Design a protein around this ligand. Structure first.
Ligand SMILES: CCCCCCCCCCCCCCCCCC(=O)OC[C@H](COP(=O)([O-])OCC(O)COP(=O)([O-])OC[C@@H](COC(=O)CCCCCCCCCCCCCCCCC)OC(=O)CCCCCCCCCCCCCCCCC)OC(=O)CCCCCCCCCCCCCCCCC
Ligand SMILES: CCCCCCCCCCCCCCCCCC(=O)OC[C@H](COP(=O)([O-])OCC(O)COP(=O)([O-])OC[C@@H](COC(=O)CCCCCCCCCCCCCCCCC)OC(=O)CCCCCCCCCCCCCCCCC)OC(=O)CCCCCCCCCCCCCCCCC
Ligand code: HEA
Ligand code: HEA
Ligand SMILES: CCCCC/C=C\C/C=C/C/C=C\C/C=C\CCCC(=O)O[C@H](COC(=O)CCCCCCCCCCCCCCCCC)COP(=O)(O)OCCN
Ligand SMILES: CCCCCC/C=C\CCCCCCCCCC(=O)O[C@H](COC(=O)CCCCCCCCCCCCCCC)COP(=O)(O)OC[C@@H](O)CO
Ligand SMILES: CCCCCC/C=C\CCCCCCCCCC(=O)O[C@H](COC(=O)CCCCCCCCCCCCCCC)COP(=O)(O)OC[C@@H](O)CO
Ligand SMILES: CCCCCCCCCCO[C@@H]1O[C@H](CO)[C@@H](O[C@H]2O[C@H](CO)[C@@H](O)[C@H](O)[C@H]2O)[C@H](O)[C@H]1O
Ligand SMILES: CCCCCCCCCCO[C@@H]1O[C@H](CO)[C@@H](O[C@H]2O[C@H](CO)[C@@H](O)[C@H](O)[C@H]2O)[C@H](O)[C@H]1O
Ligand SMILES: CCCCCCCCCCO[C@@H]1O[C@H](CO)[C@@H](O[C@H]2O[C@H](CO)[C@@H](O)[C@H](O)[C@H]2O)[C@H](O)[C@H]1O
Ligand SMILES: CCCCCCCCCCO[C@@H]1O[C@H](CO)[C@@H](O[C@H]2O[C@H](CO)[C@@H](O)[C@H](O)[C@H]2O)[C@H](O)[C@H]1O
Ligand SMILES: CCCCCCCCCCCCCCCCCCCC
Ligand code: CUA
Ligand SMILES: [O-][O-]
Ligand SMILES: [Cu+2]
Ligand SMILES: [Mg+2]
Ligand code: NA
Ligand SMILES: [Xe]
Ligand SMILES: [Xe]
Ligand SMILES: [Xe]
Ligand SMILES: [Xe]
Ligand SMILES: [Xe]
Ligand SMILES: [Zn+2]
Lengths: 40, 258, 91, 44, 56, 227, 513, 72, 75
């Protein structure tokens, strides 16, 4: 396939932020539940 | 467009139908477990409103707007045939349950069929009358079909009225036989098979009778042409399906199973 | 014993347009498969369109399972890129 | 209706950071749900 | 009965931009509003019933 | 029982389990060979810059690819069905034992001669004696005579269970209202373990089976002492 | 406008988009459930609770992965987007019924999530066998909510099947025979026929379970002369076809991906591929009792079900060999989609071969209700169906969105997922041969090493799932618009551009005879 | 044709219904109900019915449908 | 007598009817022998076979139902 250059380029820093936010959105809520199992 | 197919206007009825399904199922749950019919009665009401408006719109699209080209009609033919096939396989599951239980009666039954303590209906009395009624209705609907193709409004209406009257007669006879039956749905696998299989059949008779009554009012309003009348064809195919299921129930449950 | 309308009397909208065109041997709504010409530059397949381009599928030989798809544009006849069969747009 | 890239979807991609928030809430809520149902069952 | 299909063809082909489910006129809007209100209200009630049934 | 880092079947305790091991060896060779050939051919298709992208004729090659698999399936089915019918063969048992599945324990009935029955429960982890196995020991083992054909009849008094002893090649569903038969013959004395093998609720993981295979004379005295 | 477009749709592409979003969300639910399973099993002892909470998680895992992730993505998503485009049709036959197939799924999912929230959940297995699933051993609403979830999912799929069969039969160009339609279109038509015939039998069976639970019927209750084994026959008469329903659209996407990235105009042996899919569909109806080899059926019945099941290897092998013959001589493009497809060919083959082991009733006595079965079906589902979904997603994302993925990120994603799924499931073969049962919250100590490794694998797969969400974000964040796509002459779905207009084929294709 | 199917409706189908109606008519009237025996495979109650007192079937006929404890 | 022999009428995994038939046969024989005040020792083979094969709870349930008058088999 060919494609145009990005209309809104995502820099390495911007990618680190999106990847970090993505991973935290999975890991923090599950981690909170599993940390608190004994309490439950 | 330079094809013959129907681009349907954006419609709310798929969503109201899907939500009616949620309300009926959550409603049955609320009735079986939380002693309340309220959700179920909302779901049945929204289901009937959805069906009414959706099929009203199909009539608007076809009779009033002309979107049912031969290509569109051919698609509807396939859709109704495929729907009937799915309904056949649904009944196949109940016949399987019936043959499984009756061909290998367990010790709890007395090791015999019919089970100890079951007094079956006489298949030569009301069950035979029901058979004559649905077979007769298969003949009258065929008369109605040919009258419509021949352009005869009065005879189409008379034949279709006779067909509906026989469907109603079958339903009243079945209601009476349910009340008179000395066995119930709780009378082991005999009652279970008898009432669930005949009960789903009775529901299909009511659905098919309703479809025929829709066709009767559409005919009164001149919707059908002598060549274009798919709703009538579909109702007739459905009605033959209901007849054929009855004949299998009669031979299997009422006669061979007695 | 009458009283049932005919399609001639009561068909409307696209159903009626298809009905009236078929009486005249015409196919404006593409119900029929078009019959091929020899497909030479002198005798190209004539492809009707209501715009200035239309997709052609070329079944290059009878019973090929592979259909070759391409846009045909208004102007000089184009060739199927697999078999070289000529097609000319008639807008 | 709007046609073309970023327009044939029920969510906006006009702002990549708003989109990150929306995607976070969407996928995160699905992944979280079973942990919170387990918590619910353990707490009865 | 008289054949009034032509008058319904004219009504449902009127160039007024209405979708087919509203093209009959004001009664269609009322029946739409009743249907959608029962559906959405019933759905909110089904969610309340889940909340209630989720605890002893 | 299984041992740590085990790759294959528990060692055969019965002749039919021996047969199943040899049949599995034959079948696994075929699985290995076909898996390996597909991986090798993928790698062969992907490692050349040479090309041929014009239409390719299929019919000759499809003969090889249907016939060779058909022959391989026949070579699996033949010994598969020999073993199926061997297990089903008439053997003349010396003893009949019944087991009833319950939530969550097994009961055993030895009613050829006297009214012997008892319940068999998992030893709780906190009550294991030193050297005993977590989740596998029971209070009352299924004592049976070694080197003898035994008819085991299996049912349930509640939900589905399944009575399994892997080292004897045994797994029979425990269905209420149904009496399922299997045959058991141990070539050796010892202790042979199994676990409930149909999801049956809260303690499905915790209702094991222990057979204790001993000489007939020991089995007879044990039977008498359990009345 | 937003409500009209997204809640009142009559458009095949927008409805396909709704299905892909729904399936993606379902995949996150099913992944979380899979991690709860592996967290419980990842060290000896008890983490969550006893087998009831554990088997509620296992049961929900299966229903979510099958009915809310795989079927909606393959059939509702890829099928709605691609089938009309691949036959030059302006939409589906029943564009408004199509929208109802979609909107039945959120309510179906809501009933499943309600089942798990009320009482103690439905800890039954996805098979829902009585009497554990009956009103004594599972009293209260959970199992009824599960049955109603299945009813709504089944109506969705039955109406969808009617739509696909009608569209594929009736809405091709008049010159195009069935033997000139692409293999993906065949794969959807055959899957639709399987749905139409199988789901009504499931409907009958779970309806019988509902009446045994609520109306004092005794279909499955020996006290009334019923039989728990009748339920198993009705369930599996649906359940074997269902696994072919799960893989057939995968087979169709694999054919297109292998052809495309081999630089070929056509798959090898088109009519053999059609024959193979129809043969698998047919044979798929006559093998169900290989799920019942331990229930006590007669020896001759076991012999028949062994033999009939093994026959499926012949048409399936023709497909595997035909994919290899499509690669043969290719100008191979090592795209991420091609990597998914190559992983599929190998890993599907392994799982199909462990299925042939299981087809042998004598050996199945020892393997039934063990992790050997779990290893078999996760090779074909978590490495077959899922690899076909991921290959199709990365191949067609630019068509659907008009934007490109970052191919390097997509290759990283593939590599992590490949390691995770193999680490998860390969060791389960050893656990099954050595006798570890299914649906256990805890295991004898001997099984610890392989359970530990399996759970570590599941966490690697989680990392791949998290990265996939980032990779989709990065594509929409960066907005690299598609320009040129190769091989449009043999891939009609691309010929209207990326994304295609809301209305395509308003003027149909010209195809002569 | 329509004429032939009308001939079959009135000449064969409705006469058949009339004769079966006559047959049913002549065999109507109540048969003596059998001695109640509390068989465990009949009058199943695993869960109360969702109507009435929970112990009556939906089309309960007191004359011919005994309860688990016998006739009313 | 050691245990119930192979019976060609019941050759398959499902032995339900074997237990049932032998329980019926014992009780039919016992009724036939007690009616004439004949000898129930002639019924002994059926007794041994049903006792060997039948779960204790099945026999116990069937006996209770014969006492109650709710046994559904013909004796
Ligand atoms: C158990 C349940 C099962 C759950 C299943 C979930 C999956 C469902 C699938 C269907 C998705 C929903 C779409 C239809 C209804 C949406 C309603 C709504 O408001 O949504 C706004 C929202 C988008 O917000 P936006 O960006 O503000 O709107 C742009 C509009 O153009 C601008 O529009 P506007 O300005 O005219 O009006 C917008 C406004 C108002 O719009 C309206 O007027 C609509 C109001 C009626 C709502 C009816 C729909 C309800 C949703 C149905 C499901 C329930 O809405 C908002 O902005 C706020 C609404 C907030 C509610 C969001 C609810 C969405 C679903 C949530 C997920 C489930 C949560 C469960 C919780 C579990 C916890 C234990 O749409 C979504 O919900 C989309 C999901 C988020 C996007 C994630 C992207 C992921 C990419 C993955 C790739 C796969 C695709 C590959 C190919 C792609 C190329 C083609
Ligand atoms: C990327 C993914 C990352 C992580 C993946 C997880 C890694 C798992 C590590 C396994 C290492 C096993 C081990 O402890 O090795 C010691 C082990 C010690 O040997 P041993 O105790 O004498 O075992 C000989 C057995 O008695 C031989 O008799 P057995 O009855 O004890 O053998 C049964 C065993 C035998 O199976 C194996 O040994 C599996 C080998 C797999 C290779 C990959 O089990 C199986 O049947 C496995 C079924 C597998 C299904 C089909 C797989 C298709 C293969 C694909 C072909 C492509 C090849 C290139 O070393 C080996 O034999 C290597 C295996
Ligand atoms: C996508 C899903 C999927 C697919 C396609 C399959 C495909 C197959 N399955 Fe499987 N199966 C499951 C999903 C699937 N299965 C699930 C979910 C269960 C468990 C259900 C439950 O209990 O919850 C299961 C259970 C299951 C059992 C029951 C085991 C038990 O419970 O004890 C059996 C028994 O025969 C079976 C067999 C097979 C066979 C023979 C095929 C065949 O179709 C495979 C054919 C493929 C090949 C053989 C490979 C390619 C061929 C070649 C390279 C040619 C050469 C090969 C030879 C000569 C052998 N599977
Ligand atoms: C499609 C079906 C499917 C899939 C994909 C999986 C995936 C996984 N499954 Fe399972 N599983 C089943 C179906 C499936 N499973 C079934 C039917 C059972 C039997 C239930 C029963 O016994 O009743 C079962 C049982 C089962 C068990 C046995 C439980 C027991 O017997 O006690 C285990 C144990 O480890 C397991 C683990 C996992 C793991 C770790 C994954 C991981 O590989 C999952 C990793 C994540 C993914 C693969 C991503 C998924 C998401 C997408 C692909 C979304 C894509 C998004 C876009 C395209 C935009 N599952
Ligand atoms: C002339 C006959 C017409 C039938 C109309 C009767 C009732 C309404 C429902 C009809 C639908 C049909 C079948 C549903 C199940 C059972 C009813 C069977 C027929 C019937 O009416 O059976 C009665 C019992 O009804 C009962 O329990 C009543 C139970 C009422 C609640 C029904 C629960 C609904 C079940 C869910 C349906 C699921 C559908 C699946 C869709 C598939 C999706 C893929 C029999 O009465 P009785 O007193 O036991 O015996 C007679 C004694 N004198
Ligand atoms: C107590 C009982 C309550 C239960 C609820 C269900 C009850 C009743 C439902 C009864 C079904 C009524 C269907 C009415 C359809 C009217 C629309 C119609 O018939 O539309 C026709 C098209 O057919 C088409 O869509 C064909 C459409 C076919 C739909 C048929 C569906 C059968 C429905 C089954 C529903 C549930 C069954 C499941 C049970 C388990 C319109 O085309 P024509 O006729 O050619 O007209 C055009 C000419 O005028 C031109 O000259
Ligand atoms: C306890 C409760 C659990 C069950 C939940 C119930 C589920 C859902 C609630 C249903 C709401 C139904 C509302 C009516 C739907 C009518 C569909 C219809 O009639 O669809 C037609 C196509 O299907 C055709 O023909 C032929 C097919 C017509 C089928 C009609 C409806 C079937 C509903 C249930 C079917 C399951 C089958 C049972 C067998 C297992 C029309 O297609 P459209 O795309 O609209 O238009 C196309 C235009 O060109 C027309 O001018
Ligand atoms: C299967 C999916 C899950 C995989 C594993 C997830 C990886 C964990 C991610 C982090 O999760 C967090 O971990 C913290 C601990 O590291 C928790 O804080 C807890 O512990 C802290 C340290 O004691 C306290 O300060 C906090 O108050 C307390 O909430 C916090 O709640 C939780 O969100
Ligand atoms: C536009 C929408 C807004 C309107 C809201 C709807 C209002 C519904 C109120 C009616 O409530 C009902 O009350 C009945 C009387 O209490 C209940 O019968 C219940 O109690 C009866 C009394 O004994 C029993 O006989 C029945 O079996 C039993 O289901 C019934 O379940 C319940 O639905
Ligand atoms: C789509 C398919 C639809 C199928 C419809 C329903 C099928 C019912 C057919 C009868 O079923 C049989 O029942 C026998 C008992 O009546 C079984 O005998 C088994 O069970 C008996 C005790 O229950 C034993 O005495 C026998 O030896 C033993 O072989 C036999 O295997 C089985 O085939
Ligand atoms: C369009 C919007 C949608 C409309 C939503 C309307 C919701 C209003 C429902 C009213 O709720 C009622 O509450 C009753 C009690 O307060 C319940 O009675 C039932 O439960 C009672 C419990 O006290 C008992 O008397 C009986 O079981 C029975 O009468 C019954 O569940 C329900 O009808
Ligand atoms: C004659 C046109 C259609 C006839 C269908 C078959 C007639 C069925 C009659 C019922 C008996
Ligand atoms: Cu008992 Cu599992
Ligand atoms: O199901 O294999
Ligand atoms: Cu199967
Ligand atoms: Mg099992
Ligand atoms: Na654990
Ligand atoms: Xe194999
Ligand atoms: Xe859950
Ligand atoms: Xe869930
Ligand atoms: Xe589901
Ligand atoms: Xe279903
Ligand atoms: Zn050409």
């Amino acid at each position: 396939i060919t494609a145009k250059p990005a209309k809104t380029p995502t820099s390495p820093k911007e990618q680190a932020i999106g990847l970090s936010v993505t991973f935290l959105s999975f890991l923090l809520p599950a981690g909170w539940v599993l940390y608190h199992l004994d309490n439950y | 467009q330079t094809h013959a197919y129907h681009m349907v206007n954006p419609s709310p009825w798929p969503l109201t139908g899907a939500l009616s399904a949620l309300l009926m199922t959550s409603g049955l749950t609320m009735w079986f477990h939380f002693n309340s019919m309220t959700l179920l009665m909302i779901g049945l009401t929204t289901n009937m409103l959805t069906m009414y408006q959706w099929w009203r719109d199909v009539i608007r699209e076809s009779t009033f707007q002309g979107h049912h080209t031969p290509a569109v009609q051919k698609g509807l033919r396939y859709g109704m045939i495929l729907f009937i096939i799915s309904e056949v396989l649904f009944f196949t599951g109940f016949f399987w349950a019936f043959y499984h239980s009756s061909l290998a009666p367990t010790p709890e039954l007395g090791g015999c069929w019919p089970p100890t303590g079951i007094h079956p209906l006489n298949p030569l009395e009301v069950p035979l009358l029901n058979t004559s009624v649905l077979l007769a209705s298969g003949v009258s609907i065929t008369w109605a079909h040919h009258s419509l193709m021949e352009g005869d409004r009065k005879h189409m209406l008379q034949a279709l009225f006779i067909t509906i009257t026989l469907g109603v007669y079958f339903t009243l006879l079945q209601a009476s036989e349910y009340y008179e039956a000395p066995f119930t749905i709780s009378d082991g696998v005999y009652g279970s098979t008898f009432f669930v299989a005949t009960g789903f059949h009775g529901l299909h008779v009511i659905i098919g009778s309703t479809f025929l009554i829709v066709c009767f009012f559409r005919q009164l309003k001149f919707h059908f042409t002598s060549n274009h009348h798919f709703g009538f064809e579909a109702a007739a195919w459905y009605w033959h399906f209901v007849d054929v299921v009855w004949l299998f129930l009669y031979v299997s449950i009422y006669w061979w199973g007695s | 014993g009458g009283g049932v309308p005919t399609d001639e009397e009561q068909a409307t909208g696209l159903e009626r347009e298809v009905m009236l065109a078929a009486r005249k041997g015409q196919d404006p709504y593409n119900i029929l498969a078009p019959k091929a010409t020899s497909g030479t530059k002198e005798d190209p397949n004539l492809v009707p369109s209501i715009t200035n381009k239309r997709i052609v599928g070329c079944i290059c030989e009878e019973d090929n399972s592979t259909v070759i798809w391409f846009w045909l544009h208004k102007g000089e006849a184009q060739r199927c890129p697999s078999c070289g069969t000529h097609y000319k747009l008639v807008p | 209706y709007e046609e073309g890239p970023g327009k044939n979807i029920p969510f906006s991609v006009e702002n990549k950071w708003r989109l990150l928030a929306m995607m976070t809430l969407f996928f995160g809520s699905g992944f979280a749900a079973p942990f919170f149902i387990v918590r619910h069952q353990l707490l009865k | 009965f008289e054949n009034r299909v032509a008058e319904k063809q004219k009504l449902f082909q009127e160039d007024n931009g209405l979708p087919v489910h509203l093209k009959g006129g004001a009664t269609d809007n009322i029946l739409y509003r009743v249907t959608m209100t029962l559906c959405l209200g019933g759905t909110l009630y089904s969610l309340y019933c889940l909340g209630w049934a989720s605890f002893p | 029982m299984a041992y740590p880092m085990q790759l294959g079947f528990q060692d055969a305790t019965s002749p039919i389990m021996e047969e199943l091991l040899h049949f599995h060896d034959h079948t696994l060779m075929i699985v290995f060979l076909i898996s390996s050939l597909v991986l090798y051919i993928i790698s062969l298709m992907l490692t050349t810059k040479l090309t041929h992208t014009s239409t390719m004729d299929a019919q000759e090659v499809e003969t090889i690819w249907t016939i060779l698999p058909a022959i391989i399936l026949i070579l699996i089915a033949l010994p598969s069905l020999r073993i199926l019918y061997m297990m089903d063969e008439i053997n003349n048992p010396s003893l009949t034992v019944k087991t009833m599945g319950h939530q969550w324990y097994w009961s055993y009935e030895y009613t050829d001669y006297e009214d012997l029955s008892f319940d068999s429960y998992m030893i709780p982890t906190s009550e294991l004696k030193p050297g005993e196995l977590r989740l596998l020991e029971v209070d009352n083992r299924v004592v049976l005579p070694m080197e003898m054909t035994i008819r085991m009849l299996v049912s349930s008094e509640d939900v589905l269970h399944s009575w399994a002893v892997p080292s004897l090649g045994l797994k029979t569903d425990a269905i209420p209202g149904r009496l399922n038969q299997t045959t058991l013959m141990s070539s050796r004395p010892g202790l042979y373990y199994g676990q409930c093998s149909e999801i049956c609720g809260s303690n499905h993981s915790f209702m094991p089976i222990v057979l204790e295979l001993v000489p007939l004379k020991y089995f007879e005295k044990w039977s008498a002492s359990m009345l | 406008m937003f409500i009209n477009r997204w809640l009142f749709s009559t458009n095949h592409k927008d409805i396909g988009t709704l299905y892909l979003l729904f399936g993606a969300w379902a995949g996150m639910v099913g992944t979380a459930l899979s991690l709860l399973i592996r967290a419980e099993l990842g060290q000896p002892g008890t983490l969550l609770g006893d087998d009831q909470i554990y088997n509620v998680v296992v049961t929900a895992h299966a229903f979510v992965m099958i009915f809310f992730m795989v079927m909606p993505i393959m059939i509702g998503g890829f099928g709605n987007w691609l089938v009309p485009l691949m036959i030059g049709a302006p939409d589906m036959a029943f564009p408004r019924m199509n929208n109802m197939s979609f909107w039945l799924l959120p309510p179906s999912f809501l009933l499943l999530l309600a089942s798990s929230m009320v009482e103690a959940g439905a800890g039954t297995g996805w098979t829902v066998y009585p009497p554990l699933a009956g009103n004594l051993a599972h009293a209260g609403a959970s199992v009824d909510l599960t049955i109603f979830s299945l009813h709504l999912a089944g109506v969705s799929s039955i109406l969808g099947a009617i739509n696909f069969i009608t569209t594929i039969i009736n809405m091709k160009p008049p010159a195009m025979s069935q033997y000139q339609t692409p293999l993906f279109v065949w794969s959807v038509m055959i899957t639709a026929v399987l749905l139409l015939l199988s789901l009504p039998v499931l409907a009958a069976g779970i309806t019988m379970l509902l009446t045994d639970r609520n109306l004092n019927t005794t279909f499955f209750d020996p006290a009334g002369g019923g039989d728990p084994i009748l339920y198993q026959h009705l369930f599996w008469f649906f359940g074997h076809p269902e696994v072919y329903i799960l893989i057939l659209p995968g087979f169709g996407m694999i054919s297109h991906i292998v052809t495309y990235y081999s630089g070929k105009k056509e798959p090898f042996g088109y009519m053999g591929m059609v024959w193979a899919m129809m043969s698998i569909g047919f044979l798929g109806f006559i093998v169900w009792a290989h799920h019942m080899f331990t229930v006590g059926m007669d020896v001759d019945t076991r012999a028949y079900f062994t033999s009939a099941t093994m026959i499926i290897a012949i048409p399936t092998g023709v497909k595997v060999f035909s994919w290899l013959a499509t690669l043969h001589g290719g100008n191979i493009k090592w795209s991420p989609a091609m990597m998914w497809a190559l992983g599929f060919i190998f890993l599907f083959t392994v799982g199909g071969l462990t299925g042939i082991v299981l087809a042998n009733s004598s050996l199945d006595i020892v393997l039934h209700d063990t992790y050997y079965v779990v290893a078999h079906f996760h090779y074909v589902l978590s490495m077959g169906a899922v690899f076909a979904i991921m290959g199709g997603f990365v191949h067609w994302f630019p068509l659907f969105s008009g934007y490109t993925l970052n191919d390097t990120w997509a290759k990283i994603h593939f590599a992590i997922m490949f390691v995770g799924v193999n680490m998860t499931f390969f060791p389960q073969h050893f656990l099954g041969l050595s006798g570890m049962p299914r649906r256990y919250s805890d295991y004898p100590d001997a099984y610890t090493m392989w359970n530990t490794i399996s759970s570590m694998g599941s966490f690697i797969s989680l990392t791949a799932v998290m990265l996939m969400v980032f990779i989709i974000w990065e594509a929409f964040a960066s907005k690299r618009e598609v320009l040129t796509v190769d091989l449009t002459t043999t891939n009609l779905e691309w010929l209207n551009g990326c994304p295609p207009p809301y209305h395509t084929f308003e003027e149909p294709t010209y195809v002569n005879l | 044709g329509a004429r032939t199917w009308r001939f079959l409706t009135f000449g064969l189908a409705l006469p058949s219904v009339a004769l079966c109606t006559l047959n049913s008519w002549l065999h109507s009237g109540h048969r003596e109900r059998p001695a109640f025996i509390p068989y465990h495979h009949l009058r199943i109650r695993t869960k109360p019915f969702s109507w009435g007192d929970g112990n009556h079937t939906f089309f309960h006929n007191p004359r011919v449908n005994p309860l688990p404890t016998g006739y009313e | 007598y050691q245990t119930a022999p192979f019976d060609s009428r019941f050759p398959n995994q499902n032995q339900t009817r074997n237990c049932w038939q032998n329980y019926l046969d014992f009780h039919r024989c016992e009724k036939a022998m007690t009616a004439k005040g004949g000898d129930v020792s002639v019924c002994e083979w059926y007794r041994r076979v049903y006792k060997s094969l039948c779960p204790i709870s099945w026999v116990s349930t069937w006996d209770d139902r014969r006492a109650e008058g709710t046994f559904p088999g013909k004796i």
